[PDB]
Ligand binder design. Structure first.
Ligand SMILES: Nc1nc2c(ncn2[C@@H]2O[C@H](COP(=O)(O)OP(=O)(O)O)[C@@H](O)[C@H]2O)c(=O)[nH]1
Ligand code: BEF
Ligand SMILES: [K+]
Ligand SMILES: [Mn+2]
Length: 305
């Protein structure tokens, strides 16, 4: 089977990896990468890589992205060996600081040059962190786009749209982690289960390779109108920079029980074509899971904007 690895780069990246291991997630290998040895010693990841020990002496990059870049380059062979064998690599990082901003594009490039399908999932900083953080982050975002196959960007300011005045900050951060966690889970399930209309990792590659911005979403629903509601959920995250409008390629999977109807499959497909507003390259699949009764799940991967 294809092997999927998730790499957290810098403090936010390593936080996401820890929170996803906590949630449980298997068939996925985790790798934590950082300059900061204090933070890295707390990582729950099976594979830990301290970069730039010489440059930083176990500290972080002190918000200098050039030091994160030089720290990754210096540790290229330890990064290659941790990646080796991966068919797909998800590189997650908070843009704007020193280590994620500088090192995450180098990790991505190493992954892509070793043959993995390479997906970045990165955050931009909150506005309240100031203009410079934001400018450094935008330079990181540009570097990541040049190095990955597909990029998903999560503006942290979007978390302010889904909290109330009391929502704990750690709960907000878990919501942003879901973008990555559901993407990865979605792909993992699409590879593992055999569908009636079967999708596989060759279809993932066709839709995601060398294709810029991406959306990855899962939607689940029941009852009346379940296929439309699940498909609208899959494509409508309030956390994303890139909405599905304009998508040129789509991978879409519908999973349901024995009651799944042809009519409802068509309805869900049309939701995604309409929101696309394009002459799309759609690869459609279907799985019948008899353990499902009233539930239907729609998975969507959209690219090509
Ligand atoms: N959503 C989220 N954003 C984070 C988290 N950790 C840090 N950030 C954000 O990520 C940016 C970089 O901070 P950090 O990863 O700690 O810097 P680094 O260790 O030098 O790479 C910050 O400016 C914050 O916007 C987190 O756990 N979740
Ligand atoms: F904390 Be990051 F390395 F600047
Ligand atoms: K499959
Ligand atoms: Mn740090």
């Amino acid at each position: 089977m294809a092997t999927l690895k998730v790499i957290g780069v810098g403090g936010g990246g390593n936080n996401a990896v820890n929170r996803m291991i906590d949630h449980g997630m298997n068939n996925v290998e985790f790798i934590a990468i950082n300059t900061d040895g204090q933070a890295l010693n707390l990582s729950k990841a099976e594979s830990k890589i301290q970069i730039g020990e010489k440059l930083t002496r176990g500290l972080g990059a002190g918000a200098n992205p050039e030091i994160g870049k030089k720290a990754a380059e210096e540790s290229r062979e330890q990064i290659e060996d941790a990646i080796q064998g991966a068919d797909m690599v998800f590189v997650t990082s908070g843009m704007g600081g020193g280590t994620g901003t500088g090192a995450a594009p180098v990790v991505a490039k190493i992954a892509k040059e070793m043959g993995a399908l390479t997906v970045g999932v990165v955050t931009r900083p909150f506005s309240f962190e100031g203009r410079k953080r934001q400018t450094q982050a935008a330079a990181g975002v540009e570097a990541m786009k040049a190095a990955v196959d597909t990029l998903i960007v999560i503006p942290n300011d979007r978390l302010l749209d889904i909290v109330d005045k009391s929502t704990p900050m750690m709960e907000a951060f878990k919501e942003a982690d879901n973008v990555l966690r559901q993407g990865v889970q979605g792909i993992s399930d699409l590879i593992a289960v055999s569908g009636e209309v079967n999708l596989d990792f060759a279809d993932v590659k066709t839709i995601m390779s060398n294709q810029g911005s991406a959306l990855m979403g899962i939607g689940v629903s029941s009852g009346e109108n379940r296929a439309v509601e699940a498909a609208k959920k899959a494509i409508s995250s309030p956390l994303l920079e890139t909405s599905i409008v304009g998508a040129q390629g789509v991978l879409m999977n519908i999973t349901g029980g024995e009651s799944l109807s042809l009519f409802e499959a068509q309805e869900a497909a049309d939701i995604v074509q309409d929101a696309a507003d394009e002459d799309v390259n759609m690869i459609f699949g279907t799985v019948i899971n008899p353990e499902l009764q009233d539930e239907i799940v729609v998975t969507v991967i959209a690219t090509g904007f």
